[PDB]
PDB file of C-alpha atoms and ligand atoms in Angstrom:
ATOM      1  CA  UNK W   1      31.867  10.537 -43.791  1.00  0.00           C
ATOM      2  CA  UNK W   2      31.237   9.909 -47.483  1.00  0.00           C
ATOM      3  CA  UNK W   3      31.932   6.236 -46.821  1.00  0.00           C
ATOM      4  CA  UNK W   4      28.562   5.484 -45.240  1.00  0.00           C
ATOM      5  CA  UNK W   5      26.637   6.974 -48.204  1.00  0.00           C
ATOM      6  CA  UNK W   6      28.945   5.123 -50.585  1.00  0.00           C
ATOM      7  CA  UNK W   7      27.772   1.793 -49.172  1.00  0.00           C
ATOM      8  CA  UNK W   8      24.217   2.801 -48.270  1.00  0.00           C
ATOM      9  CA  UNK W   9      23.468   3.990 -51.808  1.00  0.00           C
ATOM     10  CA  UNK W  10      25.518   1.284 -53.514  1.00  0.00           C
ATOM     11  CA  UNK W  11      24.081  -0.622 -56.466  1.00  0.00           C
ATOM     12  CA  UNK W  12      25.532  -3.753 -54.857  1.00  0.00           C
ATOM     13  CA  UNK W  13      23.834  -5.341 -51.882  1.00  0.00           C
ATOM     14  CA  UNK W  14      25.945  -4.809 -48.777  1.00  0.00           C
ATOM     15  CA  UNK W  15      25.802  -6.940 -45.638  1.00  0.00           C
ATOM     16  CA  UNK W  16      28.131  -6.282 -42.721  1.00  0.00           C
ATOM     17  CA  UNK W  17      28.382  -8.603 -39.717  1.00  0.00           C
ATOM     18  CA  UNK W  18      30.105  -7.944 -36.395  1.00  0.00           C
ATOM     19  CA  UNK W  19      32.372 -10.085 -34.217  1.00  0.00           C
ATOM     20  CA  UNK W  20      29.343 -12.071 -33.021  1.00  0.00           C
ATOM     21  CA  UNK W  21      28.078 -12.697 -36.566  1.00  0.00           C
ATOM     22  CA  UNK W  22      25.143 -10.341 -36.072  1.00  0.00           C
ATOM     23  CA  UNK W  23      24.069  -8.226 -39.052  1.00  0.00           C
ATOM     24  CA  UNK W  24      24.921  -4.591 -38.351  1.00  0.00           C
ATOM     25  CA  UNK W  25      24.382  -3.088 -41.817  1.00  0.00           C
ATOM     26  CA  UNK W  26      21.996  -4.175 -44.578  1.00  0.00           C
ATOM     27  CA  UNK W  27      21.481  -1.669 -47.402  1.00  0.00           C
ATOM     28  CA  UNK W  28      18.482  -1.180 -49.732  1.00  0.00           C
ATOM     29  CA  UNK W  29      20.149  -3.191 -52.514  1.00  0.00           C
ATOM     30  CA  UNK W  30      20.404  -6.091 -50.071  1.00  0.00           C
ATOM     31  CA  UNK W  31      16.729  -5.652 -49.170  1.00  0.00           C
ATOM     32  CA  UNK W  32      15.831  -6.059 -52.850  1.00  0.00           C
ATOM     33  CA  UNK W  33      18.034  -9.143 -53.257  1.00  0.00           C
ATOM     34  CA  UNK W  34      16.825 -11.044 -50.156  1.00  0.00           C
ATOM     35  CA  UNK W  35      13.260  -9.771 -49.889  1.00  0.00           C
ATOM     36  CA  UNK W  36      13.814  -8.701 -46.273  1.00  0.00           C
ATOM     37  CA  UNK W  37      13.496  -5.181 -44.864  1.00  0.00           C
ATOM     38  CA  UNK W  38      16.525  -4.108 -42.818  1.00  0.00           C
ATOM     39  CA  UNK W  39      14.133  -3.944 -39.856  1.00  0.00           C
ATOM     40  CA  UNK W  40      13.826  -7.748 -40.071  1.00  0.00           C
ATOM     41  CA  UNK W  41      17.591  -8.267 -40.258  1.00  0.00           C
ATOM     42  CA  UNK W  42      19.573  -5.703 -38.271  1.00  0.00           C
ATOM     43  CA  UNK W  43      20.711  -7.096 -34.946  1.00  0.00           C
ATOM     44  CA  UNK W  44      19.848 -10.667 -35.909  1.00  0.00           C
ATOM     45  CA  UNK W  45      22.159 -13.579 -36.743  1.00  0.00           C
ATOM     46  CA  UNK W  46      23.734 -14.031 -40.172  1.00  0.00           C
ATOM     47  CA  UNK W  47      22.091 -17.477 -40.123  1.00  0.00           C
ATOM     48  CA  UNK W  48      18.777 -15.981 -41.227  1.00  0.00           C
ATOM     49  CA  UNK W  49      20.349 -14.863 -44.526  1.00  0.00           C
ATOM     50  CA  UNK W  50      21.892 -18.263 -45.315  1.00  0.00           C
ATOM     51  CA  UNK W  51      19.946 -20.658 -47.585  1.00  0.00           C
ATOM     52  CA  UNK W  52      18.170 -23.259 -45.464  1.00  0.00           C
ATOM     53  CA  UNK W  53      20.120 -26.146 -46.984  1.00  0.00           C
ATOM     54  CA  UNK W  54      23.415 -24.417 -46.130  1.00  0.00           C
ATOM     55  CA  UNK W  55      22.537 -23.364 -42.582  1.00  0.00           C
ATOM     56  CA  UNK W  56      24.055 -26.628 -41.308  1.00  0.00           C
ATOM     57  CA  UNK W  57      27.465 -25.958 -42.878  1.00  0.00           C
ATOM     58  CA  UNK W  58      27.866 -22.185 -42.954  1.00  0.00           C
ATOM     59  CA  UNK W  59      28.474 -21.629 -39.211  1.00  0.00           C
ATOM     60  CA  UNK W  60      31.688 -23.633 -39.336  1.00  0.00           C
ATOM     61  CA  UNK W  61      32.814 -21.811 -42.473  1.00  0.00           C
ATOM     62  CA  UNK W  62      32.784 -18.524 -40.561  1.00  0.00           C
ATOM     63  CA  UNK W  63      34.124 -19.913 -37.281  1.00  0.00           C
ATOM     64  CA  UNK W  64      37.114 -21.532 -38.936  1.00  0.00           C
ATOM     65  CA  UNK W  65      37.943 -18.338 -40.817  1.00  0.00           C
ATOM     66  CA  UNK W  66      37.700 -16.221 -37.654  1.00  0.00           C
ATOM     67  CA  UNK W  67      40.002 -18.416 -35.581  1.00  0.00           C
ATOM     68  CA  UNK W  68      43.348 -18.930 -37.253  1.00  0.00           C
ATOM     69  CA  UNK W  69      43.282 -15.778 -39.353  1.00  0.00           C
ATOM     70  CA  UNK W  70      41.249 -12.879 -46.769  1.00  0.00           C
ATOM     71  CA  UNK W  71      38.893 -12.145 -49.643  1.00  0.00           C
ATOM     72  CA  UNK W  72      37.242 -13.929 -52.554  1.00  0.00           C
ATOM     73  CA  UNK W  73      34.559 -13.540 -55.237  1.00  0.00           C
ATOM     74  CA  UNK W  74      32.383 -16.324 -56.646  1.00  0.00           C
ATOM     75  CA  UNK W  75      28.780 -17.057 -57.582  1.00  0.00           C
ATOM     76  CA  UNK W  76      26.366 -18.232 -54.903  1.00  0.00           C
ATOM     77  CA  UNK W  77      22.722 -19.253 -54.952  1.00  0.00           C
ATOM     78  CA  UNK W  78      20.765 -16.889 -52.703  1.00  0.00           C
ATOM     79  CA  UNK W  79      17.474 -17.901 -51.094  1.00  0.00           C
ATOM     80  CA  UNK W  80      14.968 -15.090 -50.590  1.00  0.00           C
ATOM     81  CA  UNK W  81      12.525 -14.660 -47.728  1.00  0.00           C
ATOM     82  CA  UNK W  82       9.751 -16.212 -49.821  1.00  0.00           C
ATOM     83  CA  UNK W  83      11.831 -19.257 -50.690  1.00  0.00           C
ATOM     84  CA  UNK W  84      12.597 -18.380 -54.302  1.00  0.00           C
ATOM     85  CA  UNK W  85      16.251 -18.647 -55.310  1.00  0.00           C
ATOM     86  CA  UNK W  86      18.447 -16.533 -57.566  1.00  0.00           C
ATOM     87  CA  UNK W  87      22.062 -16.779 -58.653  1.00  0.00           C
ATOM     88  CA  UNK W  88      24.314 -13.933 -57.546  1.00  0.00           C
ATOM     89  CA  UNK W  89      27.983 -13.070 -57.222  1.00  0.00           C
ATOM     90  CA  UNK W  90      29.455 -12.415 -53.776  1.00  0.00           C
ATOM     91  CA  UNK W  91      32.584 -10.384 -53.052  1.00  0.00           C
ATOM     92  CA  UNK W  92      33.470 -11.210 -49.437  1.00  0.00           C
ATOM     93  CA  UNK W  93      35.943  -9.099 -47.457  1.00  0.00           C
ATOM     94  CA  UNK W  94      37.405  -9.672 -43.995  1.00  0.00           C
ATOM     95  CA  UNK W  95      37.526  -6.347 -42.144  1.00  0.00           C
ATOM     96  CA  UNK W  96      39.712  -5.794 -39.088  1.00  0.00           C
ATOM     97  CA  UNK W  97      38.963  -2.708 -37.007  1.00  0.00           C
ATOM     98  CA  UNK W  98      39.501  -1.688 -33.389  1.00  0.00           C
ATOM     99  CA  UNK W  99      40.661  -5.182 -32.466  1.00  0.00           C
ATOM    100  CA  UNK W 100      37.557  -6.865 -33.875  1.00  0.00           C
ATOM    101  CA  UNK W 101      36.933  -8.974 -36.976  1.00  0.00           C
ATOM    102  CA  UNK W 102      34.001  -8.074 -39.230  1.00  0.00           C
ATOM    103  CA  UNK W 103      32.975  -9.294 -42.664  1.00  0.00           C
ATOM    104  CA  UNK W 104      31.412  -7.318 -45.495  1.00  0.00           C
ATOM    105  CA  UNK W 105      29.693  -9.105 -48.353  1.00  0.00           C
ATOM    106  CA  UNK W 106      29.026  -7.125 -51.524  1.00  0.00           C
ATOM    107  CA  UNK W 107      26.384  -8.785 -53.691  1.00  0.00           C
ATOM    108  CA  UNK W 108      25.376  -8.532 -57.328  1.00  0.00           C
ATOM    109  CA  UNK W 109      22.644 -10.252 -59.327  1.00  0.00           C
ATOM    110  CA  UNK W 110      23.968 -13.023 -61.586  1.00  0.00           C
TER     111      UNK W 110
ATOM    112  CA  UNK H   1      33.284   4.021 -37.918  1.00  0.00           C
ATOM    113  CA  UNK H   2      33.357   0.683 -39.736  1.00  0.00           C
ATOM    114  CA  UNK H   3      32.291   1.973 -43.161  1.00  0.00           C
ATOM    115  CA  UNK H   4      35.714   3.364 -44.032  1.00  0.00           C
ATOM    116  CA  UNK H   5      37.554   0.139 -43.043  1.00  0.00           C
ATOM    117  CA  UNK H   6      35.003  -1.930 -44.963  1.00  0.00           C
ATOM    118  CA  UNK H   7      35.945  -0.122 -48.181  1.00  0.00           C
ATOM    119  CA  UNK H   8      39.625   0.406 -47.383  1.00  0.00           C
ATOM    120  CA  UNK H   9      40.220  -3.322 -46.795  1.00  0.00           C
ATOM    121  CA  UNK H  10      37.803  -4.519 -49.457  1.00  0.00           C
ATOM    122  CA  UNK H  11      38.851  -7.184 -51.945  1.00  0.00           C
ATOM    123  CA  UNK H  12      37.225  -5.008 -54.615  1.00  0.00           C
ATOM    124  CA  UNK H  13      39.078  -1.997 -55.957  1.00  0.00           C
ATOM    125  CA  UNK H  14      37.331   1.202 -54.913  1.00  0.00           C
ATOM    126  CA  UNK H  15      37.550   4.585 -56.635  1.00  0.00           C
ATOM    127  CA  UNK H  16      35.549   7.558 -55.379  1.00  0.00           C
ATOM    128  CA  UNK H  17      35.410  10.766 -57.387  1.00  0.00           C
ATOM    129  CA  UNK H  18      33.902  14.064 -56.267  1.00  0.00           C
ATOM    130  CA  UNK H  19      31.724  16.683 -57.977  1.00  0.00           C
ATOM    131  CA  UNK H  20      34.707  17.791 -60.052  1.00  0.00           C
ATOM    132  CA  UNK H  21      35.625  14.262 -61.139  1.00  0.00           C
ATOM    133  CA  UNK H  22      38.727  14.253 -58.921  1.00  0.00           C
ATOM    134  CA  UNK H  23      39.701  11.087 -57.054  1.00  0.00           C
ATOM    135  CA  UNK H  24      39.151  11.413 -53.303  1.00  0.00           C
ATOM    136  CA  UNK H  25      39.588   7.740 -52.361  1.00  0.00           C
ATOM    137  CA  UNK H  26      41.596   4.953 -54.029  1.00  0.00           C
ATOM    138  CA  UNK H  27      42.055   1.784 -51.953  1.00  0.00           C
ATOM    139  CA  UNK H  28      44.882  -0.804 -51.986  1.00  0.00           C
ATOM    140  CA  UNK H  29      42.868  -3.197 -54.156  1.00  0.00           C
ATOM    141  CA  UNK H  30      42.585  -0.432 -56.767  1.00  0.00           C
ATOM    142  CA  UNK H  31      46.338   0.143 -56.488  1.00  0.00           C
ATOM    143  CA  UNK H  32      46.899  -3.478 -57.518  1.00  0.00           C
ATOM    144  CA  UNK H  33      44.397  -3.344 -60.382  1.00  0.00           C
ATOM    145  CA  UNK H  34      45.724  -0.147 -62.000  1.00  0.00           C
ATOM    146  CA  UNK H  35      49.369  -0.272 -60.954  1.00  0.00           C
ATOM    147  CA  UNK H  36      49.293   3.210 -59.417  1.00  0.00           C
ATOM    148  CA  UNK H  37      50.049   4.079 -55.803  1.00  0.00           C
ATOM    149  CA  UNK H  38      47.149   5.987 -54.254  1.00  0.00           C
ATOM    150  CA  UNK H  39      49.372   9.021 -53.624  1.00  0.00           C
ATOM    151  CA  UNK H  40      49.767   9.257 -57.423  1.00  0.00           C
ATOM    152  CA  UNK H  41      46.005   9.374 -57.954  1.00  0.00           C
ATOM    153  CA  UNK H  42      44.451  11.375 -55.117  1.00  0.00           C
ATOM    154  CA  UNK H  43      43.311  14.814 -56.213  1.00  0.00           C
ATOM    155  CA  UNK H  44      43.701  14.072 -59.922  1.00  0.00           C
ATOM    156  CA  UNK H  45      40.976  13.948 -62.551  1.00  0.00           C
ATOM    157  CA  UNK H  46      39.554  10.469 -63.145  1.00  0.00           C
ATOM    158  CA  UNK H  47      40.946  10.846 -66.680  1.00  0.00           C
ATOM    159  CA  UNK H  48      44.259   9.290 -65.589  1.00  0.00           C
ATOM    160  CA  UNK H  49      42.459   6.015 -64.798  1.00  0.00           C
ATOM    161  CA  UNK H  50      40.648   5.806 -68.140  1.00  0.00           C
ATOM    162  CA  UNK H  51      42.196   3.852 -71.043  1.00  0.00           C
ATOM    163  CA  UNK H  52      44.053   6.320 -73.267  1.00  0.00           C
ATOM    164  CA  UNK H  53      41.981   5.611 -76.374  1.00  0.00           C
ATOM    165  CA  UNK H  54      38.793   6.261 -74.392  1.00  0.00           C
ATOM    166  CA  UNK H  55      39.917   9.406 -72.563  1.00  0.00           C
ATOM    167  CA  UNK H  56      38.554  11.728 -75.254  1.00  0.00           C
ATOM    168  CA  UNK H  57      35.020  10.339 -74.950  1.00  0.00           C
ATOM    169  CA  UNK H  58      34.642   9.389 -71.272  1.00  0.00           C
ATOM    170  CA  UNK H  59      34.238  12.939 -69.869  1.00  0.00           C
ATOM    171  CA  UNK H  60      31.013  13.487 -71.805  1.00  0.00           C
ATOM    172  CA  UNK H  61      29.484  10.291 -70.440  1.00  0.00           C
ATOM    173  CA  UNK H  62      30.091  11.382 -66.857  1.00  0.00           C
ATOM    174  CA  UNK H  63      28.794  14.881 -67.591  1.00  0.00           C
ATOM    175  CA  UNK H  64      25.699  13.482 -69.297  1.00  0.00           C
ATOM    176  CA  UNK H  65      24.936  11.262 -66.312  1.00  0.00           C
ATOM    177  CA  UNK H  66      25.460  14.123 -63.855  1.00  0.00           C
ATOM    178  CA  UNK H  67      23.077  16.321 -65.829  1.00  0.00           C
ATOM    179  CA  UNK H  68      20.629  13.422 -66.127  1.00  0.00           C
ATOM    180  CA  UNK H  69      19.637  13.228 -62.471  1.00  0.00           C
ATOM    181  CA  UNK H  70      18.884   9.488 -62.568  1.00  0.00           C
ATOM    182  CA  UNK H  71      19.562   7.525 -59.376  1.00  0.00           C
ATOM    183  CA  UNK H  72      20.915   4.294 -60.877  1.00  0.00           C
ATOM    184  CA  UNK H  73      23.845   4.189 -63.299  1.00  0.00           C
ATOM    185  CA  UNK H  74      23.044   1.802 -66.149  1.00  0.00           C
ATOM    186  CA  UNK H  75      26.301   2.051 -68.056  1.00  0.00           C
ATOM    187  CA  UNK H  76      29.556   0.172 -67.521  1.00  0.00           C
ATOM    188  CA  UNK H  77      27.482  -2.953 -66.920  1.00  0.00           C
ATOM    189  CA  UNK H  78      29.587  -5.494 -68.834  1.00  0.00           C
ATOM    190  CA  UNK H  79      33.198  -6.694 -68.760  1.00  0.00           C
ATOM    191  CA  UNK H  80      35.625  -3.918 -69.689  1.00  0.00           C
ATOM    192  CA  UNK H  81      39.331  -3.740 -70.439  1.00  0.00           C
ATOM    193  CA  UNK H  82      41.292  -1.776 -67.830  1.00  0.00           C
ATOM    194  CA  UNK H  83      44.608  -0.189 -68.839  1.00  0.00           C
ATOM    195  CA  UNK H  84      47.349  -0.404 -66.202  1.00  0.00           C
ATOM    196  CA  UNK H  85      50.076   2.168 -65.595  1.00  0.00           C
ATOM    197  CA  UNK H  86      52.519   0.061 -67.617  1.00  0.00           C
ATOM    198  CA  UNK H  87      50.118   0.031 -70.555  1.00  0.00           C
ATOM    199  CA  UNK H  88      49.047  -3.613 -70.271  1.00  0.00           C
ATOM    200  CA  UNK H  89      45.351  -4.554 -70.265  1.00  0.00           C
ATOM    201  CA  UNK H  90      43.240  -6.731 -67.974  1.00  0.00           C
ATOM    202  CA  UNK H  91      39.563  -7.691 -68.093  1.00  0.00           C
ATOM    203  CA  UNK H  92      37.489  -6.285 -65.251  1.00  0.00           C
ATOM    204  CA  UNK H  93      33.925  -5.913 -64.024  1.00  0.00           C
ATOM    205  CA  UNK H  94      32.740  -2.560 -62.631  1.00  0.00           C
ATOM    206  CA  UNK H  95      29.891  -1.835 -60.216  1.00  0.00           C
ATOM    207  CA  UNK H  96      29.171   1.889 -60.625  1.00  0.00           C
ATOM    208  CA  UNK H  97      27.133   3.788 -58.050  1.00  0.00           C
ATOM    209  CA  UNK H  98      25.965   7.391 -57.972  1.00  0.00           C
ATOM    210  CA  UNK H  99      26.387   8.714 -54.436  1.00  0.00           C
ATOM    211  CA  UNK H 100      24.491  11.807 -53.331  1.00  0.00           C
ATOM    212  CA  UNK H 101      26.011  13.463 -50.283  1.00  0.00           C
ATOM    213  CA  UNK H 102      26.605  16.995 -49.029  1.00  0.00           C
ATOM    214  CA  UNK H 103      24.434  18.346 -51.824  1.00  0.00           C
ATOM    215  CA  UNK H 104      27.028  16.959 -54.214  1.00  0.00           C
ATOM    216  CA  UNK H 105      27.084  14.094 -56.694  1.00  0.00           C
ATOM    217  CA  UNK H 106      29.939  11.618 -56.223  1.00  0.00           C
ATOM    218  CA  UNK H 107      30.553   8.366 -58.067  1.00  0.00           C
ATOM    219  CA  UNK H 108      31.976   5.208 -56.524  1.00  0.00           C
ATOM    220  CA  UNK H 109      33.370   2.490 -58.742  1.00  0.00           C
ATOM    221  CA  UNK H 110      33.870  -0.970 -57.249  1.00  0.00           C
ATOM    222  CA  UNK H 111      36.115  -3.105 -59.440  1.00  0.00           C
ATOM    223  CA  UNK H 112      37.283  -6.704 -59.694  1.00  0.00           C
ATOM    224  CA  UNK H 113      39.512  -8.609 -62.100  1.00  0.00           C
ATOM    225  CA  UNK H 114      37.409 -10.714 -64.466  1.00  0.00           C
TER     226      UNK H 114
HETATM  227  C1  HEM Q 201      23.132 -16.052 -50.084  1.00  0.00           C
HETATM  228  C2  HEM Q 201      23.923 -16.176 -48.903  1.00  0.00           C
HETATM  229  C3  HEM Q 201      25.188 -16.809 -48.630  1.00  0.00           C
HETATM  230  C4  HEM Q 201      25.628 -18.031 -49.145  1.00  0.00           C
HETATM  231  C5  HEM Q 201      24.883 -18.973 -50.122  1.00  0.00           C
HETATM  232  C6  HEM Q 201      26.946 -18.299 -48.622  1.00  0.00           C
HETATM  233  C7  HEM Q 201      27.711 -19.414 -48.938  1.00  0.00           C
HETATM  234  C8  HEM Q 201      29.003 -19.705 -48.466  1.00  0.00           C
HETATM  235  C9  HEM Q 201      29.784 -20.860 -48.846  1.00  0.00           C
HETATM  236  C10 HEM Q 201      29.377 -21.994 -49.809  1.00  0.00           C
HETATM  237  C11 HEM Q 201      30.985 -20.769 -48.170  1.00  0.00           C
HETATM  238  C12 HEM Q 201      32.156 -21.762 -48.225  1.00  0.00           C
HETATM  239  C13 HEM Q 201      33.343 -21.157 -48.959  1.00  0.00           C
HETATM  240  C14 HEM Q 201      33.223 -21.276 -50.459  1.00  0.00           C
HETATM  241  O1  HEM Q 201      32.643 -20.364 -51.090  1.00  0.00           O
HETATM  242  O2  HEM Q 201      33.712 -22.283 -50.996  1.00  0.00           O
HETATM  243  C15 HEM Q 201      30.913 -19.539 -47.381  1.00  0.00           C
HETATM  244  C16 HEM Q 201      31.953 -19.095 -46.544  1.00  0.00           C
HETATM  245  C17 HEM Q 201      31.898 -17.906 -45.801  1.00  0.00           C
HETATM  246  N1  HEM Q 201      30.845 -17.011 -45.793  1.00  0.00           N
HETATM  247 FE1  HEM Q 201      29.103 -17.204 -46.748  1.00  0.00          FE
HETATM  248  N2  HEM Q 201      27.367 -17.271 -47.759  1.00  0.00           N
HETATM  249  C18 HEM Q 201      26.320 -16.359 -47.775  1.00  0.00           C
HETATM  250  C19 HEM Q 201      26.355 -15.158 -47.056  1.00  0.00           C
HETATM  251  C20 HEM Q 201      27.404 -14.706 -46.242  1.00  0.00           C
HETATM  252  C21 HEM Q 201      27.345 -13.405 -45.564  1.00  0.00           C
HETATM  253  C22 HEM Q 201      26.159 -12.407 -45.651  1.00  0.00           C
HETATM  254  C23 HEM Q 201      28.543 -13.305 -44.861  1.00  0.00           C
HETATM  255  C24 HEM Q 201      29.023 -12.246 -44.025  1.00  0.00           C
HETATM  256  C25 HEM Q 201      29.122 -10.863 -44.296  1.00  0.00           C
HETATM  257  C26 HEM Q 201      29.296 -14.545 -45.149  1.00  0.00           C
HETATM  258  C27 HEM Q 201      30.549 -14.844 -44.646  1.00  0.00           C
HETATM  259  C28 HEM Q 201      31.279 -15.992 -44.934  1.00  0.00           C
HETATM  260  C29 HEM Q 201      32.600 -16.271 -44.403  1.00  0.00           C
HETATM  261  C30 HEM Q 201      33.421 -15.408 -43.433  1.00  0.00           C
HETATM  262  C31 HEM Q 201      32.988 -17.456 -44.938  1.00  0.00           C
HETATM  263  C32 HEM Q 201      34.313 -18.182 -44.702  1.00  0.00           C
HETATM  264  C33 HEM Q 201      35.212 -17.790 -45.868  1.00  0.00           C
HETATM  265  C34 HEM Q 201      36.517 -18.562 -45.922  1.00  0.00           C
HETATM  266  O3  HEM Q 201      36.468 -19.813 -45.912  1.00  0.00           O
HETATM  267  O4  HEM Q 201      37.578 -17.902 -45.990  1.00  0.00           O
HETATM  268  N3  HEM Q 201      28.589 -15.396 -46.009  1.00  0.00           N
HETATM  269  N4  HEM Q 201      29.713 -18.898 -47.576  1.00  0.00           N
HETATM  270  C1  HEM Q 202      39.106   0.995 -66.578  1.00  0.00           C
HETATM  271  C2  HEM Q 202      38.427   2.251 -66.527  1.00  0.00           C
HETATM  272  C3  HEM Q 202      37.161   2.698 -67.048  1.00  0.00           C
HETATM  273  C4  HEM Q 202      36.654   2.397 -68.304  1.00  0.00           C
HETATM  274  C5  HEM Q 202      37.302   1.524 -69.414  1.00  0.00           C
HETATM  275  C6  HEM Q 202      35.374   3.034 -68.445  1.00  0.00           C
HETATM  276  C7  HEM Q 202      34.596   2.945 -69.581  1.00  0.00           C
HETATM  277  C8  HEM Q 202      33.358   3.523 -69.775  1.00  0.00           C
HETATM  278  C9  HEM Q 202      32.562   3.406 -70.980  1.00  0.00           C
HETATM  279  C10 HEM Q 202      32.923   2.629 -72.265  1.00  0.00           C
HETATM  280  C11 HEM Q 202      31.405   4.128 -70.762  1.00  0.00           C
HETATM  281  C12 HEM Q 202      30.272   4.441 -71.757  1.00  0.00           C
HETATM  282  C13 HEM Q 202      29.479   3.203 -72.146  1.00  0.00           C
HETATM  283  C14 HEM Q 202      28.770   2.556 -70.978  1.00  0.00           C
HETATM  284  O1  HEM Q 202      27.976   3.240 -70.294  1.00  0.00           O
HETATM  285  O2  HEM Q 202      29.024   1.372 -70.750  1.00  0.00           O
HETATM  286  C15 HEM Q 202      31.522   4.674 -69.413  1.00  0.00           C
HETATM  287  C16 HEM Q 202      30.506   5.465 -68.801  1.00  0.00           C
HETATM  288  C17 HEM Q 202      30.592   6.002 -67.486  1.00  0.00           C
HETATM  289  N1  HEM Q 202      31.661   5.833 -66.627  1.00  0.00           N
HETATM  290 FE1  HEM Q 202      33.318   4.832 -67.016  1.00  0.00          FE
HETATM  291  N2  HEM Q 202      35.022   3.763 -67.285  1.00  0.00           N
HETATM  292  C18 HEM Q 202      36.104   3.550 -66.429  1.00  0.00           C
HETATM  293  C19 HEM Q 202      36.170   4.088 -65.146  1.00  0.00           C
HETATM  294  C20 HEM Q 202      35.188   4.876 -64.548  1.00  0.00           C
HETATM  295  C21 HEM Q 202      35.331   5.386 -63.181  1.00  0.00           C
HETATM  296  C22 HEM Q 202      36.552   5.121 -62.263  1.00  0.00           C
HETATM  297  C23 HEM Q 202      34.162   6.117 -62.933  1.00  0.00           C
HETATM  298  C24 HEM Q 202      33.748   6.836 -61.759  1.00  0.00           C
HETATM  299  C25 HEM Q 202      33.952   6.547 -60.389  1.00  0.00           C
HETATM  300  C26 HEM Q 202      33.357   6.018 -64.156  1.00  0.00           C
HETATM  301  C27 HEM Q 202      32.101   6.608 -64.328  1.00  0.00           C
HETATM  302  C28 HEM Q 202      31.298   6.520 -65.468  1.00  0.00           C
HETATM  303  C29 HEM Q 202      29.979   7.127 -65.607  1.00  0.00           C
HETATM  304  C30 HEM Q 202      29.216   7.956 -64.556  1.00  0.00           C
HETATM  305  C31 HEM Q 202      29.533   6.798 -66.856  1.00  0.00           C
HETATM  306  C32 HEM Q 202      28.189   7.179 -67.491  1.00  0.00           C
HETATM  307  C33 HEM Q 202      27.316   5.923 -67.373  1.00  0.00           C
HETATM  308  C34 HEM Q 202      25.812   6.153 -67.489  1.00  0.00           C
HETATM  309  O3  HEM Q 202      25.397   7.296 -67.804  1.00  0.00           O
HETATM  310  O4  HEM Q 202      25.058   5.172 -67.259  1.00  0.00           O
HETATM  311  N3  HEM Q 202      34.002   5.255 -65.152  1.00  0.00           N
HETATM  312  N4  HEM Q 202      32.717   4.303 -68.830  1.00  0.00           N
END
């Protein structure tokens, strides 16, 4: 399908998480933004991509959205692997497929 | 299997054109942005989605980029006015990507209201 290439080669960083909040897709644009190689992210928890000072609050943000269920775009401060931070814009989408709830975040430098 | 749904249900409008500049994918978000139902766009030249006063010049920019061979698209980087079916205008932000697949060059535009 042309849809995989469309996201894989996208100029926007793309991060897809499964029902268990594990990262299942992390494109090259995302690698550049975070400073992580997909090999260090795929299969691991979304928690590793969340800024350290937000790790305490982010889990509940996701949990609450999953149970009781959307899309929104706003600027967020991203923390890279090396600790440096950059402002970006996130376009978050809730994706329902085959009875499961996934989330795709499309990211752009800001 | 999840890549299609991820774009189909995306909050961002998505427009995919093939090697002949014809629209092969136009999601619901794009329907809302432009005011066209996807069935009205599929198979047509991207020209119908371009503001009327820009239609004469836009084709050459796509052609030039295709002939260029560069991986990243640098243009359409700032806020642009999108013309809806009813003729009204709305400010938007485009994220243009050149997609190489099947030995062909496609373009995917991700759009949001700005
Ligand atoms: C640089 C990394 C990230 C930061 C700083 C961040 C920050 C936040 C913040 C502050 C919220 C609270 C809602 C609001 O914006 O007011 C939130 C909610 C959320 N985030 Fe993230 N996030 C990041 C990455 C991700 C990723 C990669 C995913 C998954 C693909 C994700 C999924 C969600 C979900 C599902 C919610 C709940 C949305 C809702 O309330 O409807 N986030 N995030
Ligand atoms: C609201 C509709 C649209 C408007 C107003 C618009 C406007 C423009 C303008 C003014 C340029 C030339 C200046 C620049 O590079 O910034 C341009 C270039 C271009 N546009 Fe569009 N466009 C629209 C939709 C699209 C769509 C749907 C596609 C394809 C999926 C597309 C693909 C391109 C390409 C490939 C270029 C050449 C850019 C480069 O060489 O870097 N445009 N567009």
